[PDB]
Amino acid sequence: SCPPTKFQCRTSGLCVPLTWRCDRDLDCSDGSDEEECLACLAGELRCTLSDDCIPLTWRCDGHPDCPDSSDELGCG
């Protein structure tokens, strides 16, 4: 019912992009989209598994700012 290259959330009837198709996020209310298919600056720290730098103050702040969540993994 909706344009090709966009998945349609079946219960909602709403239409969402394929990038979001099988991408671990629940973008549809019906969750149909899922089962259906460099130096760091001073004061910054590098994410363990990637290129990314975050400020030191983002360590242990309750939110995963690193792709691998390594900035909160150490905290325990």
Partner: protein, 400 residues
């Protein structure tokens, strides 16, 4: 005493909501407005199924543009999108959500760096957006470092540098209130508590003899903040009743046309504020808004407005004829059509923002100020202010 605004006439509230209603069908990214969605959800009014489509459009636009668009949204607008999520009883979540959060955190970190350890440097945007960003993160229970909060604290605390509007102070106060209610930044708890009282006092001391806080368009946000906490020792009740009187007069005189302004006022009229987004009540009953059946008589009268720009050499000064009821923007269009005048605007949540005049764009900490005679700054933008016959409108490049 408490800041209470007794319920206004339902008819009067309804006609405010009907001004918002046409925007529910304008889903293009240049027109998408998270503040409109928030204001409506916090109001006593609703647009039914249109709301769900509106939120869906917001989610599509903001997530694709910022993670994957014509003039994608700003970080300040991303903050308001976060408020929109709370208005639907959602927490920002998933991998796409986490990334959006960190982008907003980067915005705050960059502004902190721009301000500096000394606090002389300005933010690249305003302290209003700085406060809005802290609030938005706090509403989703996302924490910011004490060093980030410190810049907002210093901006309002005694012996602070610069001068902030009522709007900016109110937004700061809302951010401080969310931090305090969430027990965030406990190492700044006493200063946060003191800052809230400071903002209260400065807003009360900014009340005009008419009853507005600062001006008619600062009053809505000011009231939102004042409603969130008691103010012992002060006569907050009296001040707020006087504001209601001022607000009522302004409403009956058609002051509130702009959709963003209405979206900031509607929560107040429903006894709600942005702080109600900590524990949202999404299923509270709201009256369905129907389109105002309403004729559109054209005027028959011609008016002439003088447009002038003295900020450029050679200066511009021309008498422009338009239909009565035309906006400043209509005058600008007509001037452009007559030849010898150009200008540029950019989209914002408040509507078209004037960025350039006759080839001259506003630079850092500069803007094109709108004035009427004599030397009186407009309280509305080019698309909302409707000049009277014989008026002189000036565009003036100023530094702030």
């Amino acid at each position: 005493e408490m800041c209470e605004i007794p319920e206004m006439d339902s008819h009067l509230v309804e006609k405010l909501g009907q001004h918002l209603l046409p925007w529910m069908d304008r889903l293009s990214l240049e027109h998408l407005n998270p503040s409109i969605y928030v204001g409506l959800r916090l109001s006593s009014l609703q647009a039914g199924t249109k709301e769900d489509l509106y939120l869906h459009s917001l989610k599509l636009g903001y997530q694709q543009c910022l993670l994957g668009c014509q003039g994608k949204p700003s970080m300040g607008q991303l903050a308001l999108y976060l408020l929109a999520l709370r208005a639907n009883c959602e927490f920002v979540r998933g991998h796409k959500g986490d990334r959006l959060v960190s982008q907003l955190k980067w915005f705050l970190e960059d502004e902190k760096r721009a301000i500096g350890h000394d606090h002389k440097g300005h933010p690249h945007t305003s302290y209003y957006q700085y406060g809005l960003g802290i609030l938005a993160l706090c509403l989703h229970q996302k924490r910011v470092h004490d060093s980030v909060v410190d810049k907002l604290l210093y901006a309002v605390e005694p012996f602070h540098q610069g001068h902030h509007s009522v709007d900016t102070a109110a937004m700061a106060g809302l951010a401080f209130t969310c931090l305090k209610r969430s027990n965030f930044n406990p190492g700044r708890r006493q200063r946060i508590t003191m800052a809230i009282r400071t903002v209260q006092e400065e807003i009360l001391k900014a009340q005009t003899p008419e009853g507005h806080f600062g001006n008619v368009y600062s009053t809505p946000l000011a009231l939102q903040f004042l409603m969130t906490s008691p103010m012992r020792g002060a006569e907050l009740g009296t001040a707020c009743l006087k504001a209601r009187v001022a607000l009522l007069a302004s409403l009956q005189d058609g002051a509130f046309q702009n959709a963003l302004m209405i979206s900031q006022l509607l929560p107040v009229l429903n006894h709600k504020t942005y702080i109600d987004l900590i524990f949202p009540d999404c299923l509270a009953p709201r009256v369905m808004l129907e389109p105002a059946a309403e004729t559109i008589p054209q005027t028959q009268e011609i008016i002439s407005v003088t447009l002038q720009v003295l900020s450029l050499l050679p200066p511009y000064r021309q008498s422009i004829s338009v239909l009565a009821g035309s906006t400043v923007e209509d005058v600008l269009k007509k001037a452009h059509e007559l030849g010898g005048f150009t200008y540029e605007t950019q989209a914002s949540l408040s509507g078209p923002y004037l960025t350039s005049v006759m080839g001259k764009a506003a630079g850092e900490r500069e803007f094109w100020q709108l004035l009427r005679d004599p030397n009186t700054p407009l309280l509305q933008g080019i698309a909302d202010y409707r000049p009277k016959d014989g008026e002189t409108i000036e565009l003036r490049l100023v530094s702030w």
